[PDB]
Design a protein around this nucleic acid. Structure first.
Ligand SMILES: [K+]
Lengths: 106, 71, 88, 105, 124, 71
RNA sequence: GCGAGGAACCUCAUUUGGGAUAUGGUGAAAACCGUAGGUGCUGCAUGGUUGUCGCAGCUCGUGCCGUGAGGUGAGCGCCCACAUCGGUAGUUACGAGGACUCUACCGAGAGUGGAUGACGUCAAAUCAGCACGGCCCUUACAUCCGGGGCGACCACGUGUUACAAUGGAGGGACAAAGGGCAGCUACCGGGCGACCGGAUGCGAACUCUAAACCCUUCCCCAGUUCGGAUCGGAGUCUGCAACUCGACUCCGUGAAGCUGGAUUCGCUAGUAAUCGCGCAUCAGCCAUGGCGCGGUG
């Protein structure tokens, strides 16, 4: 668990206080930054880097108004056996893009 | 019903106006009619209009909003 | 949702906390011709339990102070400590 | 499953057929009351043998037994009367006598 | 002193202490004829004793949980395995009638979206 | 005179490793919510929150997530 | 019987009207007086979640066949709980028979329930859970408060009671699993009763948990000792406030209803059918709903 405090029958004013590189989140944020910078699809570079420095399997999903088109689409980019998970959001001029990243090497 | 340990629910401002007393306008629909109200014209709000009510001894003990339908 | 909702909720909480003493003093005794002189906002009956962050007034949970959708989101994300998903 | 008074599984199966609403001791009491009434009124052989002969009077043998029991219970419900056992005893005596709306129906 | 065994059936646990005597089965500090007033319930509890052994044993039984049919069936299982401890040659006589086997069936949990376990709402 | 130490957490391995013991019965709570964010009912999943408690005693005289009561 | 797993005020977005943009007096209140925001539009612009298709075939390379459109060696299809027995623990549980919570094997001989759902089409649903591209509101689609509405009166869906003797009533005897307790409550009396008024343990292996069943008696086929709708009176709570529009308890009143046409719905065993108990939200409650637990079967 991300939070490791103890709440005995009472979690209020504690959850509110909490609210107030093959590492899943980092590569997801890198892909989101590339998408915001309009570097197309990014996901191929991430897959190549993961295969270069030793990822057993990597899957990438991009959804949203890709390349400024007026339609939504979700395509998979899967490499490796894949026999951990992160989500990122990119705010572009055409709306929001959702990037789901899976690395199965650990 | 309202418990006897608390007594009747009569609005203090409306009671003061009636005791000091022309038609008296009010929004106190939940006020219970007291014997001092008898002989007076009270215009009760209903949502968009002030329905007048002439207080008579028979009506004593009923809420003021019973004699002013809303729908 | 909205901002006026939260603003008036905070105002109601402040007024209730301000008047929590005189109301109890009048209620312990038999006084009622003066208990109706308090402002209607000062009574603690107008205190709805909104979500702490989103502000949704339905589906509230008392233990965590959040609605069911937010609870499911944070339980899946691991943000709520201890809460897991049943294997069955 | 053994019967509590006679030790025959057929009695238990018949009570199972009689059973309503999940209440089994009520059906047992009804069956035993009817078996007592079949001896108090009319009545050769014992009540159990008379009931077996009535069942015989009323395809796999298990299916035959089940349909015979179901028919007997259905016509016991169909016939009039106040107490269910007081009714059903008439079906046992009438199937022994080989008559009535129950037989060959 | 006392040959010990345990029986379980649904949410009912029975404990048996079988000692040499003459009948006189006592359950929960109460006589067997007054704790279970139904003749069917007394026939289930005292079933394996009559199968082989009655009037030659004094039995004390502690019961907790379940209903009257759950407890009576649980008590029968406990006595059945207590008799095989006294004599290892009585095992086939009790297994043939089906007394030592425990029935593991318990009330199934209620699945969400349905009013009962396997009962669904009316679609129409 | 004696000192009783009662540990409680939400991880059995965590309390077992923390306590260097009578194991008390656990307190399991089950939360049921709708999977969807809208009218789609009859599709629910269960979240379990467990509390594990242990007791130890010293006669005549820790990781985060454990609360210990000393009496 | 949905978002809603708590619409008297608040929630509340909807309507009518009054405002603004220390003490007094005037006021229904807000308020007065002197001394960035949108629960607005666009799910046919989106993310993230969900339901269906309802599923056994989803991809990566070589050769070969065809003028062509095309045909044809590697990666992928477990977990949790319940049964039996064998070693350690002993308190607010009963010195180790059960409970309670940690481990290890479990047929080659004489399993079940549930969650995972790579494999999917519906421009399927969700801008009102939450973010967000575009457009439109600023002397008002923004904002505060009183009083009303969401509860007003034929059709469809989902249920609860019954229409009774395998039953209703009266009096005794029964023995459960789970889940709550700043609130439940040991005990004494005012009480017909809802719970009030003095006191006692308890922030939890001290406090709320049975009914169907098992005896005894009455009712004897009657719209009844079946049924409990509607309406008059008395009250007990909560709450500033119970008229529109709360729950509960007494006393009356006592309705339709005699097992239901064409058709249609749910399941294959601790299962249907029945009986009670508990919880979520919550001052109170519309809870006959949702989520669970056990009896007999
Ligand atoms: K409230």
């Amino acid at each position: 668990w991300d939070s490791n405090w103890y709440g005995g029958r009472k979690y209020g004013e504690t959850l509110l206080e909490d609210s107030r590189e093959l590492d899943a989140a980092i590569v997801a944020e890198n892909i989101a930054r590339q998408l915001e910078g309009k570097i197309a699809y990014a996901v191929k570079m991430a897959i190549a880097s993961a295969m270069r420095m030793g990822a057993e399997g990597i899957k990438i999903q991009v959804s949203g108004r890709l390349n400024g088109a007026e339609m939504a689409r979700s395509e998979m980019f899967k490499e490796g056996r894949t026999p951990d998970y992160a989500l990122a959001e990119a705010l572009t001029k055409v709306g929001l893009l959702g990037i789901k990243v899976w690395i199965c090497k650990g | 019903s309202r418990s006897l340990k608390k007594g009747p629910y009569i609005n203090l401002k409306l009671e003061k106006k009636v005791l000091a007393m022309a038609v008296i306008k009010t929004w106190a629909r939940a006020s219970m009619i007291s014997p001092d109200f008898v002989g007076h014209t009270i215009a009760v709000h209903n949502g968009n209009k002030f329905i007048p009510v002439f207080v008579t001894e028979n009506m004593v003990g009923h809420k003021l909003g019973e004699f002013s339908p809303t729908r | 949702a909205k901002e006026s909702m939260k603003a008036r909720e905070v105002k109601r909480a402040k007024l209730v906390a301000k008047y929590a003493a005189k109301r109890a003093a009048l209620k312990a005794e038999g006084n009622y011709e003066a208990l109706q002189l308090l402002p209607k906002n000062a009574s603690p009956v107008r205190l709805h339990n909104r979500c702490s962050m989103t502000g949704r007034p339905k589906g509230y949970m008392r233990q965590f102070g959040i609605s069911r959708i937010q609870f499911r989101e944070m339980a899946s994300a691991g943000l709520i400590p201890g809460v897991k998903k049943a294997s069955w | 499953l053994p019967d509590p008074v006679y030790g025959d599984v057929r009695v238990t199966k018949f009570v199972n057929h009689l059973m309503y609403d999940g209440k089994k001791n009520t059906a047992f009491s009804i069956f035993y009351g009817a078996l007592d009434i079949v001896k108090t009124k009319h009545s050769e052989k014992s009540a159990l043998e008379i009931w077996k002969a009535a069942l015989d009077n009323i395809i796999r043998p298990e299916r035959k037994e089940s349909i015979s029991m179901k028919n007997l219970i259905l016509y016991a419900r169909k016939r009039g009367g106040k107490t269910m056992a007081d009714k059903l005893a008439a079906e046992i005596v009438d199937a022994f006598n080989n008559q009535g709306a129950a037989f060959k129906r | 002193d006392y040959i010990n065994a345990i029986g379980r059936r649904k949410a009912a646990v029975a404990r048996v202490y079988l000692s040499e005597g003459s009948g006189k089965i006592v359950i929960n500090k109460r006589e067997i004829e007054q704790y279970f007033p139904s003749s069917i319930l007394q026939y289930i509890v005292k079933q394996p004793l009559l199968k082989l052994v009655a009037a030659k044993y004094d039995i004390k039984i502690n019961l907790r949980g379940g209903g009257f049919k759950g407890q009576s069936e649980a008590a029968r299982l406990a006595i059945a395995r207590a008799l095989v401890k006294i004599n290892p040659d009585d095992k086939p006589a009790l297994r043939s009638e089906g007394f030592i086997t425990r029935d593991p069936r318990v009330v199934e949990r209620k699945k969400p979206g349905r009013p009962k376990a396997r009962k669904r709402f009316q679609f129409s | 005179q004696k000192i009783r130490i009662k540990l409680k957490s939400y991880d059995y391995m965590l309390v077992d490793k923390s306590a260097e013991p009578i194991p008390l019965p656990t307190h399991k709570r089950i939360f049921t919510v709708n999977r969807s964010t809208f009218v789609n009912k009859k599709s629910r999943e269960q979240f379990e929150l467990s509390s594990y408690k242990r007791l130890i005693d010293i006669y005549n005289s820790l990781p985060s997530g454990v609360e210990v009561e000393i009496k």
